[PDB]
Amino acid sequence: MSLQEKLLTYYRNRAAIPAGEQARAKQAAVDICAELRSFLRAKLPDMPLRDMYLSGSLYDDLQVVTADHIQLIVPLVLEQNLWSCIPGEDTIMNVPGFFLVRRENPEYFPRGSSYWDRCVVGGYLSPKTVADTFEKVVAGSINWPAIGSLLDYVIRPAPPPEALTLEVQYERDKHLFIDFLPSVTLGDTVLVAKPHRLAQYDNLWRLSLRPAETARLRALDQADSGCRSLCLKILKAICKSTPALGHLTASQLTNVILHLAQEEADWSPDMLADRFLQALRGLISYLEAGVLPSALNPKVNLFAELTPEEIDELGYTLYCSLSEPEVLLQT
């Protein structure tokens, strides 16, 4: 049979979402998203935000390759007057590519001049505070299954520390997750409050990379009708199924593939199996080294959040795969 054929087989059987189901999944998210606006259009203002949006509603599949959960961005509006963002590199700590947001010009515009002065601690805008002030609309200031009833789904938020995340069964067989993620844009630079992990103590703002990451990927495979996304989807599925490998994230996997695209031109369909093995060796190499640089921002190490016991486990599992990759398909 061969790896190629087995990989394709695993794709269709374990990894891929049927066109129909996918559409219905998109519908759910788009509907949930609509109604959450209707909840905040009533509740607010006070908090200054643009409309919530779902990334990337332009693609059907919705970027659930690159991935984790469907992402519901909530853009916080800030005065470009009153706020500068300081790179994590130039701290006061030392943590690329996270950023501190510094309250500027008390020198001019005293406290109370912004809504966002109520989420400052120590001269700096605080993703955790911001996330919290937020999380106490979610789990559960919402009249939750009243919107469940309206649309014929089950909508319940995961219990903390993911009160931001939501579970929705869209059909009876299947279920689906939606992340709320607060975002601020200060000039060129866009940031999200996905907390760091340790964060020292608590904590900095995270540079958003998923949308750029998914755009390169979309584009490369457009260029040459190549098999980069397919190869990624399969690694993602294997990692979702194989408990040892669960510690690996969408972003990590995505960046392994992007580095491999930098190194290899070919990605014709018949190259799947080789590129697949190379991703495994790439992973092993990045894990040995303890660093996976972001393809888009080489100073950022995506493996910096992994605990060393995780790295340990992953490396061993991958090391053992290499001679019989077939075993990864039967988890």
Numbering used by the authors: 133 to 463
Authors' description from the paper:
MiD51 and MiD49 are anchored in the mitochondrial outer membrane via their N-terminal ends, and most of the protein is exposed to the cytosol. MiD51 and MiD49 specifically interact with and recruit Drp1 to mitochondria and then facilitate Drp1-directed mitochondrial fission. Crystal structures of the cytosolic domains of MiD49 and MiD51 were reported and indicate that these proteins possess nucleotidyltransferase (NTase) folds and belong to the NTase family. MiD51 does bind adenosine diphosphate (ADP) as a cofactor, but MiD49 lacks this capacity.
To understand how MiD51 interacts with Drp1 during mitochondrial fission, we performed crystal structure studies and solved two types of MiD51 crystal structures under apo conditions. Type I contains the cytosolic domain MiD51129-463, and the crystal space group is P41212 with one molecule per asymmetric unit. The overall structure consists of a central β-strand region flanked by two α-helical regions and looks similar to NTPase family crystal structures published by two groups. The Type I and Type II crystal structures are almost identical, with a RMSD (root mean square deviation) variation of 1.14 Å for 329 aligned Cα atoms. By comparison, we found that all of the released crystal structures of MiD51 from PDB, which include different nucleotide forms (Apo, ADP or GDP), lack distinct conformational changes when compared to the Type I and Type II crystal structures, with RMSD variations ranging from 0.97 to 1.88 Å. And the ADP/GDP binding sites are almost identical, which implies the structural rigidity of MiD51. It was reported that MiD51 can form dimers primarily based on the crystal packing of MiD51, but we did not observe such packing in our two crystal types. DBS1, containing R234, Y240, F241 and R243, is located on an exposed loop of the N domain. We define this area as DBS2 (Drp1 Binding Site Two), which is located on α12 and α13 in the C domain and forms a surface for Drp1 binding. We also determined that MiD51 forms dimers through an interface close to residue C452 located in the C terminal region, although the majority of MiD51 protein exists as monomer.
